[PDB]
């Protein structure tokens, strides 16, 4: 039956598109983001295990088969997912749809459906297959609708303005159509009857008509621009406000570029909606009016003008696609050249050391040759389109004049009628040209709209959790992990089953090495992720029930890689909390040892902060972050080592801060050196996903365990 293949919206989603296409091949449509998150795509790529996982949960009875050299037997159920290494650069996934008569058909997500033979295809793909089959517990359902239906919801409140564009738009042409008739009047009332005074009057009349038309054009355009600005701003702002309320896995899956490009995508939809909702409503009416009027003027040459438009439309449609393919090829080759230029400039040290300037010059010349060949090939395509448009545009005018003259000789129409007709043909040709030219806009706009709406429909962070807020006013209690297990993604679970206990208001240290998720536990306690197995108990109550906002406002966390935002210290230090007095700020600065590098600043009141400023030092950034954490005044704080800038002297001030806080608060320090943890009440050592033992320095040393070996390694 019908073949289906879903394109790429981003560049890392090769694996997800194949599964979506296979689902749609069996009547299952799902938003690409909702399958993307389920299969757990990472930044680097997609592991086949994730595909099998999402398949067996979705309903498909998948199997991971080591595809042999011979895969021609008619035994397994087609279609199936295959993995390839495209031109030996990076891995990629395609799907095999039909196998018969020494022909393979693959629905490449990159391109359309493409056909290969035995040898050329068999050379490229290195085994591997994923069998999919819609067995039991499968249902054909579609969770995705039309995104534009949602987006018109932004247009609806701004209704009154639209009609003001529409109401003016009629009164525009209603004058313009009159303005065309002047050429007829002159050749009827003035040339033959030499009515001088009437000529003077009609001149001023048509002049004031034209100035009225221009004024109305101005009034229309101002409203169009204002409406476009309003729609565009609303779309961007709604999207950006929604993005912030998602769990962290969304942000870890994608990069920063694929979140920013959504803003240009939204800007595209402004033009799409404005152009469509204006043209479809006004230009078709103008075309109808023009057609009726010219049918009144003359029937036959109306059919001439109709065939002119038909040929123009056919010419545009036949050339729409090859231009797009040529443009895509040019855009690929240009980047493939830019890569070589950048590499050569970077490695000119080696190039000059070995004296191989000709070797790079010839290769760059060959690649420039390819770029120029592609550019000229596409330029010839524009040349052909322009010539084929010009033939119609000119021959149509010539035959229009010829038919008009022939009808004049027969005695059916007058010369003034001919000239008015020829002048008014603009009002029936141009609107149709605009209607035809707008088809690519809708074609790209629907894809852009789907791409942006997939993110919007995705579940927000708040909605997932279940809340019980009024029962627990106070965070205070013992921290415990009960049989908690965790994995970042399809990756092997970094954190295993652990059992840990933390009493009230005690100093706790966490020591780990070689990246065993030492900071992972801090984020899990911050409830950025959810443990699928196990739970976190505070005051004998599981974290999942406590309100998320109170937690996030009453947990203190300092990033191992501190981040500061551009602006002024006064507001940047109190990020998150408004209505803050200077007294507690300065006391926090005193206790966090922050005031002593404020005098050297230009103005204490307004110290303008720059991103990646040369003045700023990482020690000062971490001190600022610690100041914010103490300003949050919680009972639960998490901190990481300075690792630089005289850690020994900062140790004294940190110990003054924690000891001088004078409350029964809980603090968790994560570090890789044992020097400061000697006085810690309780220390936890983490190795390869397991807490080896719980205790303090004295008995860990007496235990004759591995901690003894690390301590001797230190000294």
């Amino acid at each position: 039956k019908k073949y289906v293949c879903v394109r790429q919206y981003d560049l890392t989603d090769c694996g997800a598109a194949c599964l979506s296409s296979i689902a749609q091949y069996y009547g299952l449509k799902m938003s690409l983001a909702k399958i993307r998150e389920m299969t757990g795509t990472d930044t680097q790529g997609t592991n086949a295990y994730g595909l099998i996982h999402a398949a067996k949960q979705l309903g498909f009875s998948a199997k991971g088969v080591k595809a042999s050299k011979e895969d021609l037997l008619k035994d397994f159920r087609l279609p199936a997912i295959a993995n390839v290494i495209v031109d030996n650069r990076l891995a990629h996934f395609v799907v095999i749809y039909s196998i018969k008569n020494r022909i393979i058909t693959v629905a490449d997500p990159g391109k359309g459906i493409v056909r290969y033979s035995m040898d050329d295809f068999c050379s490229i793909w290195t085994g591997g297959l994923v069998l999919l089959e819609p067995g039991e517990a499968f249902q054909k359902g579609d969770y995705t609708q039309n995104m534009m239906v949602k987006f018109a919801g932004f247009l609806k409140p701004l209704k009154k303005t639209v009609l003001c564009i529409f109401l003016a738009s009629l009164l525009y042409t209603a004058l313009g159509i009159a303005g065309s008739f002047y050429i007829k009047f002159l050749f009827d009332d003035l040339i033959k009857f030499e009515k001088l005074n009437d000529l003077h009057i009609i001149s001023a009349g048509f002049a004031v008509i034209f100035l009225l038309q221009i004024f109305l054009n101005y009034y229309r355009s101002i409203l169009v621009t204002k409406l476009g600005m309003s729609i565009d701003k609303s779309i961007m702002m709604e999207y950006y406000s929604h993005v912030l309320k998602l769990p962290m896995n969304f942000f870890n899956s994608r990069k920063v570029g694929e979140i920013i490009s959504r803003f240009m995508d939204a800007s595209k939809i402004r033009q799409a909606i404005s152009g469509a909702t204006l043209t479809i409503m006004i230009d078709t009416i103008m075309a109808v009016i023009g057609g009726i009027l010219l049918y009144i003027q003359n029937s036959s040459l109306f059919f001439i003008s109709f065939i002119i438009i038909l040929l123009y439309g056919i010419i545009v449609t036949v050339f729409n696609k090859p231009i797009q393919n040529a443009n895509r090829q040019i855009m690929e080759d240009n980047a493939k050249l830019t890569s070589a230029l950048v590499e050569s400039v970077k490695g000119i040290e080696t190039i000059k050391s070995f004296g191989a300037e000709e070797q790079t010059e010839k290769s760059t010349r060959d690649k420039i040759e390819t770029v120029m060949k592609s550019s000229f090939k596409e330029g010839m395509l524009y040349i052909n389109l322009s010539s084929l448009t010009g033939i119609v545009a000119g021959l149509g005018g010539i035959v229009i004049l010829w038919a008009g003259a022939y009808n004049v000789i027969k005695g059916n129409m007058s010369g003034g009628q001919l000239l008015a007709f020829n002048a008014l043909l603009a009002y029936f040709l141009t609107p149709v040209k605009n209607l035809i030219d707008l088809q690519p806009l809708i074609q790209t706009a629907v894809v852009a709209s789907n791409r942006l709406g997939e993110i919007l429909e995705l579940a927000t962070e708040k909605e997932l959790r279940e809340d019980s807020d009024d029962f627990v006013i106070s965070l205070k209690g013992d921290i415990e992990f009960r049989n908690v297990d965790f994995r970042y993604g399809l990756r092997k679970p970094v954190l295993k089953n652990i059992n840990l206990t933390i009493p009230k208001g005690k100093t706790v240290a966490i020591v780990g090495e070689s990246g065993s998720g030492k900071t992972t536990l801090a984020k899990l306690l911050m409830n950025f992720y959810s443990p699928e197995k196990g739970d976190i108990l505070i005051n004998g109550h599981s974290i999942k029930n406590i309100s998320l906002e109170l937690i996030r406002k009453k947990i203190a966390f300092v990033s191992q890689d501190v981040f500061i935002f551009s602006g002024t210290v006064k507001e940047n230090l109190c990020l998150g909390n408004e209505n803050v007095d200077m007294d507690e700020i300065i006391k926090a600065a005193k206790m966090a040892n922050a005031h002593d590098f404020i005098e050297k600043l230009p103005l204490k009141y307004d110290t303008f902060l720059n991103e990646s400023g040369a003045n700023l030092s990482e020690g000062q950034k971490q001190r600022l972050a610690i100041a914010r954490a103490l300003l949050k005044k919680p009972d639960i704080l998490i901190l990481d080592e300075a690792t630089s800038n005289l850690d020994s002297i900062t140790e004294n001030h940190i110990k003054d801060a924690i000891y001088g806080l004078e409350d029964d608060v809980t603090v968790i320090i994560i570090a890789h050196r044992l020097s400061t943890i000697v006085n810690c009440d309780k220390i936890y050592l983490l190795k390869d996903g397991e807490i080896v033992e719980s205790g303090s320095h004295t008995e860990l040393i007496a235990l004759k365990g591995c901690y003894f070996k690390m301590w001797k390694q230190t000294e």
């Binding site: 090769c14 790529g45 997609t46 086949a48 295990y49 991971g64 035994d75 990629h92 591997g128 092997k492």
Partner: peptide, 17 residues
């Protein structure tokens, strides 16, 4: 469905994208 079975380790090592 008679092809040679593939272990999960290769599935993890199969980094497509």
């Amino acid at each position: 469905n008679i092809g040679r079975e593939l272990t999960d380790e290769e599935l993890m090592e199969m980094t497509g994208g």
